[PDB]
Amino acid sequence: MKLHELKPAEGSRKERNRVGRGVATGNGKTSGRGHKGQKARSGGGVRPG
Amino acid sequence: MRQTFMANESNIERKWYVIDAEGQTLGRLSSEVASILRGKNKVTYTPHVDTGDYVIVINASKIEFTGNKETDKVYYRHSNHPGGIKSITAGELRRTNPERLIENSIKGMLPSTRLGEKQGKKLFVYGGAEHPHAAQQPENYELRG
Amino acid sequence: AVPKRRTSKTRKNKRRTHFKISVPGMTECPNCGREYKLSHRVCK
Amino acid sequence: PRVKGGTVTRARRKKTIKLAKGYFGSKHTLYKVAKQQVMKSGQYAFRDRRQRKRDFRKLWITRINAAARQHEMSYSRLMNGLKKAGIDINRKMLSEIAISDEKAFAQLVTKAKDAL
Amino acid sequence: MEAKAVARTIRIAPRKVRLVLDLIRGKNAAEAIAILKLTNKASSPVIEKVLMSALANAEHNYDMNTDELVVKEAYANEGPTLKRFRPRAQGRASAINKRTSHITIVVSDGKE
Amino acid sequence: NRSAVSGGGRKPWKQKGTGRARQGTIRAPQWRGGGIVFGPTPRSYAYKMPKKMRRLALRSALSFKAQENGLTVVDAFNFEAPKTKEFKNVLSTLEQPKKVLVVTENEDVNVELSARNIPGVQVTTAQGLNVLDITNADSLVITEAAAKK
Amino acid sequence: MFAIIETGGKQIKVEEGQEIFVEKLDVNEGDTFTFDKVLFVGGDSVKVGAPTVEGATVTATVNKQGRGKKITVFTYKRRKNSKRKKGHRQPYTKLTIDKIN
RNA sequence: ACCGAUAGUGAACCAGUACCGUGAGGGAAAGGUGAAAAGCACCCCGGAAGGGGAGUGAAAUAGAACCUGAAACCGUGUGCUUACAAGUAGUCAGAGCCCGUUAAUGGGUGAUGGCGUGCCUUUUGUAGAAUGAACCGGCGAGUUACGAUUUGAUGCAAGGUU
RNA sequence: UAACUUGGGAGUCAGAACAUGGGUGAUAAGGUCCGUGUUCGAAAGGGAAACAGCCCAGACCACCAGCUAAGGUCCCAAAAU
RNA sequence: GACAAUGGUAGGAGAGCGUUCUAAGGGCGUUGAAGCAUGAUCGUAAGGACAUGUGGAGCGCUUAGAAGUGAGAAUGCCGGUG
Ligand SMILES: [Mg+2]
Ligand SMILES: [Mg+2]
Ligand SMILES: [Mg+2]
Ligand SMILES: [Mg+2]
Ligand SMILES: [Mg+2]
Ligand SMILES: [Mg+2]
Ligand SMILES: [Mg+2]
Ligand SMILES: [Mg+2]
Ligand SMILES: [Mg+2]
Ligand SMILES: [Mg+2]
Ligand SMILES: [Mg+2]
Ligand SMILES: [Mg+2]
Ligand SMILES: [Mg+2]
Ligand SMILES: [Mg+2]
Ligand SMILES: [Mg+2]
Ligand SMILES: [Mg+2]
Ligand SMILES: [Mg+2]
Ligand SMILES: [Mg+2]
Ligand SMILES: [Mg+2]
Ligand SMILES: [Mg+2]
Ligand SMILES: [Mg+2]
Ligand SMILES: [Mg+2]
Ligand SMILES: [Mg+2]
Ligand SMILES: [Mg+2]
Ligand SMILES: [Mg+2]
Ligand SMILES: [Mg+2]
Ligand SMILES: [Mg+2]
Ligand SMILES: [Mg+2]
Ligand SMILES: [Mg+2]
Ligand SMILES: [Mg+2]
Ligand SMILES: [Mg+2]
Ligand SMILES: [Mg+2]
Ligand SMILES: [Mg+2]
Ligand SMILES: [Mg+2]
Ligand SMILES: [Mg+2]
Ligand SMILES: [Mg+2]
Ligand SMILES: [Mg+2]
Ligand SMILES: [Mg+2]
Ligand SMILES: [Mg+2]
Ligand SMILES: [Mg+2]
Ligand SMILES: [Mg+2]
Ligand SMILES: [Mg+2]
Ligand SMILES: [Mg+2]
Ligand SMILES: [Mg+2]
Ligand SMILES: [Mn+2]
Ligand SMILES: [Mn+2]
Ligand SMILES: [Mn+2]
Ligand SMILES: [Mn+2]
Ligand SMILES: [Mn+2]
Ligand SMILES: [Mn+2]
Ligand SMILES: [Mn+2]
Ligand SMILES: [Mn+2]
Ligand SMILES: [Mn+2]
Ligand SMILES: [Mn+2]
Ligand SMILES: [Mn+2]
Ligand SMILES: [Mn+2]
Ligand SMILES: [Mn+2]
Ligand SMILES: [Mn+2]
Ligand SMILES: [Mn+2]
Ligand SMILES: [Mn+2]
Ligand SMILES: [Mn+2]
Ligand SMILES: [Mn+2]
Ligand SMILES: [Mn+2]
Ligand SMILES: [Mn+2]
Ligand SMILES: [Mn+2]
Ligand SMILES: [Mn+2]
Ligand SMILES: [Mn+2]
Ligand SMILES: [Mn+2]
Ligand SMILES: [Mn+2]
Ligand SMILES: [Mn+2]
Ligand SMILES: [Mn+2]
Ligand SMILES: [Mn+2]
Ligand SMILES: [Mn+2]
Ligand SMILES: [Mn+2]
Ligand SMILES: [Mn+2]
Ligand SMILES: [Mn+2]
Ligand SMILES: [Mn+2]
Ligand SMILES: [Mn+2]
Ligand SMILES: [Mn+2]
Ligand SMILES: [Mn+2]
Ligand SMILES: [Mn+2]
Ligand SMILES: [Mn+2]
Ligand SMILES: [Mn+2]
Ligand SMILES: [Mn+2]
Ligand SMILES: [Mn+2]
Ligand SMILES: [Mn+2]
Ligand SMILES: [Mn+2]
Ligand SMILES: [Mn+2]
Ligand SMILES: [Mn+2]
Ligand SMILES: [Mn+2]
Ligand SMILES: [Mn+2]
Ligand SMILES: [Mn+2]
Ligand SMILES: [Mn+2]
Ligand SMILES: [Mn+2]
Ligand SMILES: [Mn+2]
């Protein structure tokens, strides 16, 4: 390992999903639609009605 | 674009033809004349230019109909003035000035395009048996099928 | 009543084809080297 | 760190706008309009690439039909007669032969009227 | 060679200056001088002064034959626009453009 | 932060009847000079690794130096030098760590020398060990690293 | 003289001396090539084959092996969120004919 | 492994200031000649403003509204083209005229023919006469901390770990 | 040629027409409420003048190649006066 | 060399392009950097070069690291200009 040739273990790492950046990507509504996919997202943590 | 042919002003010479209308049905003559005019029939046909020939129609007056002549088949026309559908002359119209009856019929078989409108200018219907246009020495053309 | 769509560069230009002062009627002035409007006075 | 936005995108939009060349006025100037016009331009180009293949087939068919009509035979029967004789030579070829060599096309015509 | 002079930042609107300029363009120096003198628009004295100066430094700086000259080209370009406003009814105020123009004139002769 | 920006939290204009868009603060994120959404905030950037791994790494570093070259020397001397460059009478390449038994001063004041660095050995980075090019544990220090295994 | 060869997906009217272009032949550049499949010949004396004229072949020098100018297959579906842009250069041979039959 | 003049303090500039309110209070915009002011003597047009010479300068096509100088937008010159034609502006076909390239089955214009009701949102369904955008520019939205969980990688392993 | 099991991540809970078996309505509705099927949604292409839901039929990309489907073959307009 | 598969909204999954900063390595640059402008250039895409002009300092490449990482729409904010 020569410091200008570092290589992570195959399978050690992979890129985070950046949603909301384009359309070809596949997130632009980002996820869901029309519902409780507001910033609150208040599915009250575990319950129905 | 591998080698198919398209005619232009160089190439595409066009002849004159005389067609007696006497003894003919209106549509049956009008359609075939529309073909001579659009310029099919010849194999140097190509859509974006006038490949068509010139057609004089002699004896417009002797053109023939069927079921109902002066009866039934009306020729309507609005003037874009309100209620003014001054839309009369029955298909009878050949009594009055028939060269329009034929030229209109044949024109209705031509495409609405500027080219189609140029192609229509090559018709020359005449109700009488003689034509002025001998100088462009026309041939007679027997009306096929 | 207000415009419903904007005039194009080109529309507005066709509109202004008649909008121009034309060359004044002028003539060879007093033999004094001047230049004056037609039918109007020489000035000294 | 902070990525100041500048100068990737003035050069993107520059590309798309350069794509809109012969376009009328604002369609060849602004990015939005040019983007629309080029997208649709591509969509039309995709349909029209398919349909062109139709337009040319139909052209040859009309001219062939013409060459046949000159010989008192319909295109409809000249094709069946060629197939029956197994001539298997396409319409672009047939039309161009009709235009370049009336004699040879005549030979084909008789070959088709034969075997009927 | 063929000479030029500019009147930068003049307080006339270019849309207006261009009106007279269009009369002047391509005319012989005397005609253009006349037309400038007799035209009733406001830009006329200004463009007069500019065609004049262009002719002057055409003579002193290039020893040009002041008779044989033509107005090779002439035009106005947008200058900086000072921005004002007028008060209107119900306390609102509205924009106003005090526009300015870079007039340019170029006298010439036998080009080569 | 938007709470942070110096401006006020008065509503820029009424919710309806303007034909302007609804607005809440002149310091809202879509505004010029408004609050920043989700920018950098101060934070640690630092983490733990299992100890055995770290030893395995140091070991791996040095063993990588032996796959190449990490040469061994007698020991140290005096008080101030540009003769250390002359002590590259041994070939000793360009990037340089001199490992020493236990905080040798003086040798440590042979520094402003471009590409060279020294530590103890109880120290001994898993980094300087790699930029490295060529290490030299003196000899005492080499057996020290051996004892620390 | 006049000859019709069934080579690509398609037929060609080669004229002896004439440059042509067809889908790539997987043969050497500069090499000579010959088409086994020929339908028709013309000029004075005319052979008109069934499937093929029973013997004749057109011949040609290979001039170049290359790829056509890129076209840009961009398509999209309005209001539905998709679009798709692919590129395309189509490979071809450029034979030059010599000696029909 | 913070900002680099719409950023970073509201304030890189004599900012809590112009300006706004009876008042508490609110609260901006605005950085860059050059290495050196060597900041254009002098002549010419002009009342001046401005400009052409002549000069300083590597450069003023660096001249003070001064580094670079994009786009919208405004103008001058024109090669091809257009005054019987019904047009979401293009696309496919194509003569004609003009030109000559990162030289490759080239570039510009376009008589004429075919095909063809922008985008976004939102909808069962929008050319839609449903919403949104005058244009161009910059700025403008899944982040971080801590926990839980699961997968991937690595180390030890009846032990692992601080 | 799939099926099930456990685990990670979801979206969806406004539906539309047509054919058919029905309720409701007036054997009214482009009505409404269920059962079965198809298409649209989320599907471009050819036919039905135009015409989401009908008919043929599911576009990896290129061709100035060929056979067909539903529809069609006097002219507009490819193909039988 | 065969032979299959490759319409698609919410959505799941995968491979990648590019921007800033860091590290190490290796390079260009007043014989002219970035930026800008034009071009008929290249790759399957995001995109990458090359030449000439402008400009007058700073920049790329490779491997990996990290993010204020990508805009056309919010009657979005500011500026300019129709
Ligand atoms: Mg609860
Ligand atoms: Mg081609
Ligand atoms: Mg070709
Ligand atoms: Mg009446
Ligand atoms: Mg009446
Ligand atoms: Mg009346
Ligand atoms: Mg019409
Ligand atoms: Mg018959
Ligand atoms: Mg005007
Ligand atoms: Mg054009
Ligand atoms: Mg595009
Ligand atoms: Mg189309
Ligand atoms: Mg205004
Ligand atoms: Mg708080
Ligand atoms: Mg020291
Ligand atoms: Mg293309
Ligand atoms: Mg500030
Ligand atoms: Mg008050
Ligand atoms: Mg000077
Ligand atoms: Mg100057
Ligand atoms: Mg300025
Ligand atoms: Mg400009
Ligand atoms: Mg002209
Ligand atoms: Mg003009
Ligand atoms: Mg067209
Ligand atoms: Mg051309
Ligand atoms: Mg057609
Ligand atoms: Mg609605
Ligand atoms: Mg429901
Ligand atoms: Mg319901
Ligand atoms: Mg029923
Ligand atoms: Mg019912
Ligand atoms: Mg219903
Ligand atoms: Mg549809
Ligand atoms: Mg229906
Ligand atoms: Mg039609
Ligand atoms: Mg019959
Ligand atoms: Mg370079
Ligand atoms: Mg470029
Ligand atoms: Mg340009
Ligand atoms: Mg770069
Ligand atoms: Mg990089
Ligand atoms: Mg990285
Ligand atoms: Mg906006
Ligand atoms: Mn990814
Ligand atoms: Mn999706
Ligand atoms: Mn809903
Ligand atoms: Mn939404
Ligand atoms: Mn939801
Ligand atoms: Mn909230
Ligand atoms: Mn004008
Ligand atoms: Mn920075
Ligand atoms: Mn008042
Ligand atoms: Mn606050
Ligand atoms: Mn409050
Ligand atoms: Mn408004
Ligand atoms: Mn701030
Ligand atoms: Mn700046
Ligand atoms: Mn006051
Ligand atoms: Mn300074
Ligand atoms: Mn004076
Ligand atoms: Mn002065
Ligand atoms: Mn000098
Ligand atoms: Mn500088
Ligand atoms: Mn400047
Ligand atoms: Mn007319
Ligand atoms: Mn005309
Ligand atoms: Mn219409
Ligand atoms: Mn073309
Ligand atoms: Mn149409
Ligand atoms: Mn969007
Ligand atoms: Mn509705
Ligand atoms: Mn709308
Ligand atoms: Mn409307
Ligand atoms: Mn709404
Ligand atoms: Mn609006
Ligand atoms: Mn904008
Ligand atoms: Mn979240
Ligand atoms: Mn339910
Ligand atoms: Mn019903
Ligand atoms: Mn049902
Ligand atoms: Mn939906
Ligand atoms: Mn119908
Ligand atoms: Mn249709
Ligand atoms: Mn068939
Ligand atoms: Mn059938
Ligand atoms: Mn037909
Ligand atoms: Mn797919
Ligand atoms: Mn498929
Ligand atoms: Mn995903
Ligand atoms: Mn930079
Ligand atoms: Mn350059
Ligand atoms: Mn470089
Ligand atoms: Mn990287
Ligand atoms: Mn951002």
Tab-separated table of C-alpha atoms (C1' of nucleotides) in Angstrom, chain J residues 19-81:
chain	number	residue	atom	x	y	z
J	19	U	C1'	-18.236	19.966	-9.633
J	20	U	C1'	-15.263	21.738	-4.825
J	21	C	C1'	-11.843	20.615	-1.256
J	22	U	C1'	-7.830	17.009	0.923
J	23	A	C1'	-3.781	13.402	0.538
J	24	A	C1'	0.056	10.972	-1.907
J	25	G	C1'	2.272	10.401	-6.662
J	26	G	C1'	3.486	12.435	-11.251
J	27	G	C1'	3.110	16.789	-14.601
J	28	C	C1'	1.858	21.850	-17.480
J	29	G	C1'	2.448	27.102	-17.123
J	30	U	C1'	4.520	34.696	-18.989
J	31	U	C1'	7.824	30.188	-25.190
J	32	G	C1'	1.867	32.102	-21.790
J	33	A	C1'	-2.839	29.354	-16.346
J	34	A	C1'	-7.986	29.521	-15.111
J	35	G	C1'	-12.160	31.758	-17.232
J	36	C	C1'	-14.373	33.244	-21.931
J	37	A	C1'	-15.401	32.699	-27.603
J	38	U	C1'	-15.686	29.915	-32.086
J	39	G	C1'	-15.070	25.286	-34.606
J	40	A	C1'	-17.383	20.594	-39.358
J	41	U	C1'	-13.775	16.345	-32.796
J	42	C	C1'	-14.465	11.884	-29.720
J	43	G	C1'	-17.555	8.151	-26.185
J	44	U	C1'	-23.626	4.148	-25.594
J	45	A	C1'	-25.298	8.279	-21.881
J	46	A	C1'	-24.052	12.007	-18.099
J	47	G	C1'	-19.630	13.902	-20.812
J	48	G	C1'	-13.976	14.177	-22.688
J	49	A	C1'	-10.181	16.254	-25.732
J	50	C	C1'	-7.942	19.201	-29.848
J	51	A	C1'	-7.079	23.892	-32.610
J	52	U	C1'	-7.394	29.185	-33.211
J	53	G	C1'	-8.817	33.966	-30.785
J	54	U	C1'	-9.246	36.598	-26.029
J	55	G	C1'	-7.002	36.715	-21.442
J	56	G	C1'	-2.496	37.545	-18.106
J	57	A	C1'	-2.009	34.127	-13.836
J	58	G	C1'	-2.452	29.777	-11.929
J	59	C	C1'	-3.760	24.965	-13.238
J	60	G	C1'	-4.472	19.446	-14.740
J	61	C	C1'	-3.585	14.150	-14.726
J	62	U	C1'	-3.582	9.224	-11.443
J	63	U	C1'	-5.329	6.580	-6.767
J	64	A	C1'	-7.941	7.314	-2.722
J	65	G	C1'	-10.556	10.598	0.955
J	66	A	C1'	-14.580	14.081	1.980
J	67	A	C1'	-18.690	17.023	0.708
J	68	G	C1'	-22.454	23.993	1.220
J	69	U	C1'	-21.588	17.883	-5.308
J	70	G	C1'	-25.393	19.073	-10.410
J	71	A	C1'	-31.718	23.590	-11.243
J	72	G	C1'	-36.227	25.128	-15.768
J	73	A	C1'	-40.624	25.614	-13.079
J	74	A	C1'	-41.661	26.795	-5.754
J	75	U	C1'	-47.681	33.762	-8.024
J	76	G	C1'	-39.536	31.249	-5.081
J	77	C	C1'	-35.089	35.695	-3.518
J	78	C	C1'	-31.615	39.368	-5.940
J	79	G	C1'	-29.698	41.631	-10.280
J	80	G	C1'	-29.972	43.002	-15.056
J	81	U	C1'	-32.763	43.590	-19.510
